[PDB]
Amino acid sequence: GLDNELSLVDGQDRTLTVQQWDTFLNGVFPLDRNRLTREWFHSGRAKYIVAGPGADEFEGTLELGYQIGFPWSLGVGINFSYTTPNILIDDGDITRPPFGLNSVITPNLFPGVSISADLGNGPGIQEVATFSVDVSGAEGGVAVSNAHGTVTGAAGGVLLRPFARLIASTGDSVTTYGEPWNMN
Amino acid sequence: GLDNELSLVDGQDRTLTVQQWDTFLNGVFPLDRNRLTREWFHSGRAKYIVAGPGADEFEGTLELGYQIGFPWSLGVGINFSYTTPNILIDDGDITRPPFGLNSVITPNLFPGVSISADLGNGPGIQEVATFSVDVSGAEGGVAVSNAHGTVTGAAGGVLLRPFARLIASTGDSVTTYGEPWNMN
Amino acid sequence: GLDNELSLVDGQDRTLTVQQWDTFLNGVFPLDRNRLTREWFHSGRAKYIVAGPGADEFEGTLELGYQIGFPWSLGVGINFSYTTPNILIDDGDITRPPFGLNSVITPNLFPGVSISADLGNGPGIQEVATFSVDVSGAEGGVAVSNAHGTVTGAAGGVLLRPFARLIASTGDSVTTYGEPWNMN
Amino acid sequence: GLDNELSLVDGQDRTLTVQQWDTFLNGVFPLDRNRLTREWFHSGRAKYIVAGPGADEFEGTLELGYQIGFPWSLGVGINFSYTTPNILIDDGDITRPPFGLNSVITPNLFPGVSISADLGNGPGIQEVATFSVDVSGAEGGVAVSNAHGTVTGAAGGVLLRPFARLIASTGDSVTTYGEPWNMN
Amino acid sequence: GLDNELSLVDGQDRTLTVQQWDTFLNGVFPLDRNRLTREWFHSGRAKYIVAGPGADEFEGTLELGYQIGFPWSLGVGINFSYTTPNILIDDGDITRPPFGLNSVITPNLFPGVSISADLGNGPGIQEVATFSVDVSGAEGGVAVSNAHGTVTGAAGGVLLRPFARLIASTGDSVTTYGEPWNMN
Amino acid sequence: GLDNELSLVDGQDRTLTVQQWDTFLNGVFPLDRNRLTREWFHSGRAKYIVAGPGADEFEGTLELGYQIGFPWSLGVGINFSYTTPNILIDDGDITRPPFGLNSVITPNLFPGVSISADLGNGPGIQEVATFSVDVSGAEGGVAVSNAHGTVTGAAGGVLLRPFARLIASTGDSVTTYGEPWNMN
Amino acid sequence: GLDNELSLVDGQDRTLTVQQWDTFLNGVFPLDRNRLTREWFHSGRAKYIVAGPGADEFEGTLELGYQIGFPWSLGVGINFSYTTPNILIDDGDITRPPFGLNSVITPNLFPGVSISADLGNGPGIQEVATFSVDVSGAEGGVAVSNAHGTVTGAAGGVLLRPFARLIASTGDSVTTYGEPWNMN
Amino acid sequence: GLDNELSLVDGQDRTLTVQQWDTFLNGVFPLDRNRLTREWFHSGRAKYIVAGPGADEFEGTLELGYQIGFPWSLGVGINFSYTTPNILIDDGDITRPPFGLNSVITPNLFPGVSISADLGNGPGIQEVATFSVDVSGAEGGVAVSNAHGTVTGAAGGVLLRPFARLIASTGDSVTTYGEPWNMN
């Protein structure tokens, strides 16, 4: 049904209304099985109405999309390393027995694994446009089912804020916002 | 209502007036729940008037926007690391017992976390144009409701200064400035 | 046969149906004989139907493809090194015998090999379009046999999710998704 | 009023005069509250006169702007860091009590802050064009009120030198310069 | 003769057949005499047939080429170095004889050579198009003799998989693959 | 007056003459008050004459400018740093009093300033074109007053060599050079 | 005279012949007197013939060039350095005579030169096109005298393999190869 | 006068002759007074003659220029540095007098200068085109006086090899070379 709506008396006395219908953000288990990944499908409709002078020769653009935000970037690195046995002489006496072999340095003698995880402030708030298209005339107009979206390297919970926007060819714009959906 | 206004007698004797109406910069809790992020919605109208010779065949551009300034950039990094037990021989004697095992170096024996926060001078003062469009004739013209803006990696308070600008196709320009809004 | 299907009543009352037929993602032993490489062949058909007003003057785009996800990036590096024998004097006395040769540093005395493997979080979820083409009229339309796909530096299992997409010239879109195929 | 003026007998015997009127560079407290930032508003008019043969079919370009110079770049960085307690064994004996725990290295035991400020020779002298536009005919033409300008990372005093320039379509040019304005 | 063939009933009921004839991949001793280099000459023909409705007004693209894969990248570096004799005083006493010359550090006393070879996972599977050209009508069409191909920095054996591809202007595609040729 | 002149009998028997008149390179105290900056104003005229066959339908390009050279690049960097008091234990015994506090490392105990100046060979000899424009017919043509030029990071004296150039649409060219002006 | 030749029955039954005549690759002592540089002059002619249906309305491209290969890249670096005398106190006692001057570190006391030569695997096999031009009709067509080629940073001998190529506008191609010329 | 000449019977039986006349490369003391810089002025004429069928409707390109080569790149860097007096405690006992002040590290106690010069193999052989222009008809055509050229960072002597080139619109080319001029 109708999720949300906003109206604007524009700069040439037209009433511009933009609406969001049937919005669904469907979070799924990530294809990559990566705990830092989020993945979802966006369905919904954007509609517009224009009333007042010139209503029928209205030219504009209609968009549907979402903003996304999460607090931290996270990366994880795991290293395996091994180095074959060796010796270098360090502060050794090579003039007489045992020729500096009483003062050697070796590499690490065993194979080893190390892990390193980095957490930093996130990339901020981003905007995705599911569609952005030309419309004309007083009413319309556009619907989407099962558009795909994803983000990775994310931690602390991913929030998605759906919007619909109408921009008049004339410069005027109104956008309506919905309640956010939690991908965590 | 009318927020602010400015007039200019231009280079061919036209009086150019640009105005800001109904301005609202609405700071909200950030979608990304990041203390270094600020997020807001811009509403307002820009109007112009042109008087004197040629008024009716005026060609121009109308803009509405804001400048943003904050004093410091801030970044935060937290690292978790652990390395598997190992030894290397350092200045050891491999000719006789105990074959240098009386002088070893190991990696850190425990898992460890470290935090690093960097504060530096900020990126200076930036300008955003919420809309910038062609206008013609003596009066107009353009309105916006709930346009979105954001910035991250910011500290010490974010200030937003709203403006409206009129540029004549002829080169002349006047811009009016409003009272700043505090996002912190 | 028919694998999967989805319908949408669009923004101007047309019923848009997109379908996936005969889908085969054929994983093969990799040409490069690299355990971090995966390689496959994509076959299938995408069909569409449009019903309701204007059905016959429908303009659109039809795509067939897949998303790919795997959890980890992996890289492996093996180094062989050898350095010719040398000495430098370190904290040596050059005023008297044996002129500092009782305190030398050498390079590693033997040839050596070392291995280093790095595992990190993967690149997230990617989309590939096997074909994306213009279609017009009420029904169609497009088939592919043995298109090639590949990815390398991958670990933890590669998953492929096939889709078909129909985008109306009018902005409306519907995409249908199939059951994923395992390349590991 | 008239601030400054310059004339040139050009390459085809036209007298070209360019003038600066009503120039004001208004330094303000920086929106970003950053001591390395300067911010100002430029108002003024540029006029031109062309006399001699062909005066009425003169084609050219008119500009108004300023050069900016300051002696030093300055940046400031403040780091906070803390690392969780740890030990590695350094030149320790692991064959017998106390197993090398008599020779350990730790990280810094306390949290710490460090500051680093860098001062270097500045970026040199830069030119900003407030407007740059086509003019035609013997007289004109162009005015600006409250154009915005800023610079950051600056130290040692910021000077602004206003100019007006006329370039004939024919190649000839004259520019007039004003007295500089101090932003510190 | 005919090496391999594949057919497809396309999205508008045309039968599309693509074929590979007379394929020869001729591996030669590399011009650069570099053991990490492979070099070869590709000869062959691609043909196509289209049957069913509209056969004679078929528009498309014909390609011939190969995929290449090898498991490892390899690089080798050899350094020669020598440094002229010198001394620095390290932890020396300059208040009394012999003024710290009893505790010096020198550079390496001899000339030296070191070798370093790096082996890492390879670049994955790549595609080369020997030709890719427009065709029209029901049958054709294109042949190549002695086209050149090469790759360097390769180890573990280089495999080359020949293909021919037909893409209809309409989106449909079929590609046929041959048996791979070993460049090692 | 006339500064300098050069003539060329070109490839189709036209005599091409290019001349420099009234040349002034006016060095001023730098706007940025930076000892590594030089700043100046260029005034002058370039004239051409063409004689012989086709003189009146001559098409060309006329330029006026200078080359600049200085021997050294110079940069200066001054750092202020301070680090808060801390300790780490280095080769300490943590099994018994005083728990390694008899062997600590600290950061620098005082605030500190350091200066670093780098002198290197300069960027070589550069060419600036004050104007470069199309001319037609047997005589002309172009004049400039108070064009601006600058350079920074310079040491050892900045030299400016003025020139005028005429390029025929036919490829032929002649350039005349003046006596250099010293900006140091 | 005729150096080499190759024929192909193409995809529409035309016999395509490409030929190399009078080929000379003239190695000279390098202008830069650099032992890692090679320099040469290429002379030769490329001819084509087309027989069978449509021979006279043949459209194509004719090229002449060479491939170049050498086994190793080589670079050489020589550094001169000197540092003015200095001291720092290292593990010194500043509470009592001689105030740590019994334990100083200095820089290198003498001026010094060091040389570093790096040999690595070469850049592989490259192709240069001396000319590549449009041809039409049954026979032609193109000749070159003393075209220049060069390469630097090369070691182990530079080999040049001359070719001529004919590409039909229809996609078909044949290339003929000559005996290689040694630039070392 | 005539310096050098070369002729070619081209691919369509035209005799193509290209010539160099009046060539002068005038080395001067470098404007930048930099010993690694070379600077010169190029004067000369290129002529061409075409004989045989179609001579009068010949279309082509005429160039005049030089190759440049020198064996070494050279760079020089001089650093001045000073650091204000400081102390850190190294392996000090802070539990009892004198609290680790018996084991300190300082920065260098004096101001210091260091020089570093790097010599490496040169950039190879480069080509400059003084002019490159369209010509038509059987004879011409183009002359240059006092064109400027320069290079810096050079050592071991700079050689300049003058050439003239004629390229037929048809692909054919001949170039003639002169005796080299020494800029050292």
UniProtKB/Swiss-Prot annotation, chains A, B, C, D, E, F, G, H:
InterPro entries: Leukocidin/porin_MspA_sf, Porin_fam_mycobact-type
Gene Ontology MF terms: porin activity
GO cellular component, one term: pore complex
Swiss-Prot/TrEMBL induction comment: Constitutively expressed.
Main location as per UniProt: membrane
Domain of life of the native organism: Bacteria
Keyword Transmembrane recorded: yes
Gene3D superfamilies in alphabetical order: Porin MspA (Ig-like beta-sandwich domain), Porin MspA ribbon domain
Result of knocking out the encoding gene: Single deletion has decreased permeability to the antibiotic cephaloridine (9-fold), glucose (4-fold), serine, phosphate and iron Fe(3+). Growth rates are wild-type, due to the other Msp-type porins. A double mspA-mspC deletion takes up less cephaloridine, glucose, serine and phosphate than the single mspA deletion and grows slower than wt or single mspA deletion. A triple mspA-mspC-mspD deletion grows even slower and has reduced Fe(3+) transport compared to wild-type.
One BP term from GO: iron ion transport
SUPFAM superfamilies: Leukocidin-like
Entry keywords, A to Z: Cell outer membrane, Cell wall, Ion transport, Iron, Iron transport, Membrane, Porin, Secreted, Signal, Transmembrane, Transmembrane beta strand, Transport
Subcellular location: Cell outer membrane; Secreted, Cell wall
Function (record text): The major porin in this organism, forms a water-filled channel which favors the permeation of cations, amino acids, iron Fe(3+) and less efficiently phosphate. Does not transport Fe-ExoMS, the predominant siderophore. Plays a role in transport of beta-lactamase and hydrophilic fluoroquinolone antibiotics such as norfloxacin as well as chloramphenicol. There are about 2400 porins in wild-type, 800 in an mspA deletion and 150 in a double mspA-mspC deletion.
UniProt free text on domains: The rim domain (28-96 and 152-211) is accessible from the external milieu and is partially embedded in the outer membrane. The stem domain (131-148) is inaccessible from the outside and embedded in the outer membrane, while loop 6 (121-127) is thought to be in the periplasm.
Oligomer status and interactors: Forms very stable octamers. Isolated as a 100 kDa complex that can be reduced to monomers upon boiling in 80% dimethyl sulfoxide for 15 minutes. Structures show a goblet with the wide end on the exterior of the outer membrane and a central channel. It is not known if mixed oligomers of MspA with other Msp subunits form in vivo.
Similarity comment text for this entry: Belongs to the mycobacterial porin (TC 1.B.24) family.
Name of the protein this chain belongs to: Porin MspA
Species annotation: Mycolicibacterium smegmatis (strain ATCC 700084 / mc(2)155)
Encoding gene per record: mspA
